Amino acid sequence: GSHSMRYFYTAMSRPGRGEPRFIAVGYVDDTQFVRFDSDAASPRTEPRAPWIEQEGPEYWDRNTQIFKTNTQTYRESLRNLRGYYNQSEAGSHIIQRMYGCDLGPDGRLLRGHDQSAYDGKDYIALNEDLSSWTAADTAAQITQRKWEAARVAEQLRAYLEGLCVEWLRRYLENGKETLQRADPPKTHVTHHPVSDHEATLRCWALGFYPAEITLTWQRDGEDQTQDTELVETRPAGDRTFQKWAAVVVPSGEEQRYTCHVQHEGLPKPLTLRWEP
Amino acid sequence: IQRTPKIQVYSRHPAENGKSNFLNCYVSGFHPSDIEVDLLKNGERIEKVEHSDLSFSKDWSFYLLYYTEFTPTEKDEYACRVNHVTLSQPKIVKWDRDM
Amino acid sequence: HPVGQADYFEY
């Protein structure tokens, strides 16, 4: 199938409470495989999936060097952005960065990403051309000028088209039994009366991987988008995910409703109804 | 500006009384990242709760999973108590095994 | 594996 690698960096200032915290986590699809936390007693890159443990000491040392450097650099960057927005030294602020590469089902580069945010708003992003930037405001335009002078885009393009894909393909091979295994959802429909003449049909999907899934209700074959309560897909804690979709139906009309489930793990898409 | 957490409380496996399981509280969609989450058993804070490493979604909002081993019973009440800068008072969400 | 030098550039 299609696969991606992402690193998620969070750098958070906390005036009066020491220097900014830097966190980095790395993912392949919905599977985290490393972390680094500058607040840890002894900050180092740590494995978070069994298949990465086989990487050698030089891998771990190199990762930790990079993340320690990031920790220092992001502290300067946070200072910089405070200034760009004429902000007081009193407030806490956050820079987030997420970057990485996407492969298609044939394993070749689909596209690269490098995106940053400040206090939860888009700040600056590498365009899909991996050559130019989109800056959100006049502050981000200052970052853009700096990054053009440092040839940052060119350096990211090299990483995204080169090492990013190489490593992702390596991880996909080393973790093939899990990373390249789609687990289909176990599904059922439950029925809960909500009154004398309405009941809740809840369509459940459990134990699936990856997290991407589509869960819909139809009445007489017609989508019930507005009437369906859809919870956010949630992690079970064993790598798998869970989701449900609920609809409130007139009592007696239950058989007019069908739950439809699409997932990569499914040999065939599912159509489910309540089975009294 | 800021985003208040969504909260879901649920079990890792389908709940069966007297069978060991994991109680999960998933907080998501929040910003900024500082957040306080406790799992409760009959109103009292459970002690040895673990959580996932901070990460975030495509919209930049943060999410975390807090979890602990538990054995569901007929009468024991479980819940998740969350405080965030967006909340004037901690929000308590009860575990409902049909949810 | 994370990128290195490119990220060493302050915002």
Domains of chain A, start order: 1-181 (3.30.500.10), 182-272 (2.60.40.10)
* Cβ atoms < 10 Å from Cβ of A268: 6
Residue at B95: amino acid letter: W
Distances (CA, A) of A243 to A273, B26, B30, B73: 17, 12, 19, 24
Could you tell me if A199 and A249 are in contact, meaning their C-beta atoms sit under 8 angstroms apart? yes
Question: What does the radius of gyration of chain B's CA atoms come to, in whole angstroms?
Answer: 14
Please count the other Cβ atoms lying within 10 Å of the Cβ belonging to residue A189: 18
Torsion over CA of A105, A106, A107 and A108, rounded to 10 degrees?
-110
Tokens of A52: 């990465």
CB A71 within 8 A of CB A22: yes
Amino acid symbol at A49: A
Beta-carbon separation of B53 and A96 below 8 A: no
Q: What is the resolution of this structure in A?
A: 1.9
Position B62, amino acid: F
Q: What is the DSSP string of chain A?
A: --EEEEEEEEEE--TTS-SPEEEEEEEETTEEEEEEETTSSS---EE-SGGGTTS-HHHHHHHHHHHHHHHHHHHHHHHHHHHHTT--TTS--EEEEEEEEEE-TTSSEEEEEEEEEETTEEEEEE-TTSS-EEESSHHHHHHHHHHHHTTHHHHHHHHHHTHHHHHHHHHHHHTHHHHT-PBPPEEEEEEEEEETTEEEEEEEEEEEBSS--EEEEEETTEE-TTT-EEPPPEE-SSS-EEEEEEEEEETT-GGGEEEEEE-TT-SS-EEE----
> A233 and A207 in contact (C-beta within 8 Å)?
no
Longest dimension (CA), chain B: 45
The CATH number of whichever domain residue B5 belongs to comes to: 2.60.40.10
Contacts of C5 in chain A (CB under 8 A): 155
The answer to whether the CB atoms of B26 and A32 lie below 8 A apart is no
Contact A159 C9 (CB under 8 A): no
- Measured distance CA(A238)–CA(A30) in Å, rounded: 12
Q: How many domains does chain B have?
A: 1
For residues A208 and A259, give the distance between their C-alpha atoms in angstroms, rounded to a whole number.
Answer: 17
Single-letter amino acid, residue B7: I
Tokens at A253, concatenated = 């009309």
Whether A156 and C5 lie within 8 Å, measured CB to CB = no
Beta carbons of A252 and A260 less than 8 angstroms apart = no
d(CA B60, CA A212): 18
In angstroms, how far apart are the furthest CA atoms of chain C? 22
Contact: B32, A119; criterion CB under 8 Å: yes
Whether C1 and A167 lie within 8 Å, measured CB to CB: yes
State both tokens at A25. Answer: 């986590």
Q: What is the dihedral of CA A55, A58, A60, A65, to 10 degrees?
A: -150
Cβ within 8 Å of B, A 87-116: 92, 94, 96, 98
Distance set, CA C7 to CA A73, A79, A99, A151 (Å): 8, 16, 11, 11
> In what helix (H) or strand (E) does residue B83 lie, and over which residues does it extend?
strand B78-83
Residues of B in contact with A98 (CB under 8 A): 56, 58
How many CB atoms are located within 10 Å of the residue B47 CB?
9
In chain C, helix, strand, coil percent, each to 5?
A: 35, 0, 65
CA angle A12, A148, A122 (to 5 degrees): 40
Interchain CB contact of B51 with A (< 8 Å): no
d(CA A131, CA A156): 9
Nearest CA in chain C to A118: C11
Q: Is A95 left (phi over 0), alpha (psi -120 to 50) or beta?
A: beta
Answer for the pair B84, B35: CB distance below 8 angstroms, yes or no. yes
Q: A25: which chain B residues are within 8 Å (Cβ-Cβ)?
A: 53-55
Residue A72, CA distances (Å) to A66, A155, A216, A218, C10 in order: 10, 20, 47, 53, 10
- Range(s) of the domain holding residue B15: 1-99
CA dist., res. B56 & res. A10, Å (int): 9
Q: How far apart are CA A124 and CA A78, in angstroms?
A: 14
Candidates B37, B30, B24; CA nearest to A238 is B24
Residue-wise burial string across A40-54, b where 16 or more C-beta atoms lie within 10 A, e elsewhere: eeeeebebbbebbee
Question: How many C-beta neighbours within 10 Å does residue A155 have?
Answer: 18
| DSSP secondary structure string for all residues of A244-261 | EEEEEEETT-GGGEEEEE
Residues of A in contact with C3 (CB under 8 A): 7, 66, 99, 155-156, 159, 163-164
Chain C neighbors of A125, CB-CB under 8 A: none
Cβ neighbours of residue A151 closer than 8 Å, sequence gap 6 or more: none
